[PDB]
């Protein structure tokens, strides 16, 4: 259905973008969250 | 290597669509959880 | 702006494939988390 101009490509790539960074973001409060746990888990809790 | 067409760009499209979509849910929860948390410090927990 | 080649279209098809992957993997853990929670809301705490 039609070309694909480098114009919207750049625009979806942008989208792309945004969605790495919040989602490496996330990924990482997740890390910092899942190793508290842990440091719980060895004290006892 | 060849060129693409504008019915798998609206595809790959929706797939980044779906991902916002369901992203910000996640993102939402976390924020909802990262708070009581925060409530409990307040509270003394 | 110009004309989008299969090469850059794959390529960033791929990023859109690892964010699903790592999404999915993220969303579970956050149901396998927030369920515990209730398991613990059903058990009294």
Sequence with gaps: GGWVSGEEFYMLTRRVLQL????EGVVSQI???????????????
């Design 20 to 23: 790495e960074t919040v989602l």
């Design 31 to 45: 890390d910092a969250v899942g190793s508290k746990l842990k440091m719980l888990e060895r004290k006892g809790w």
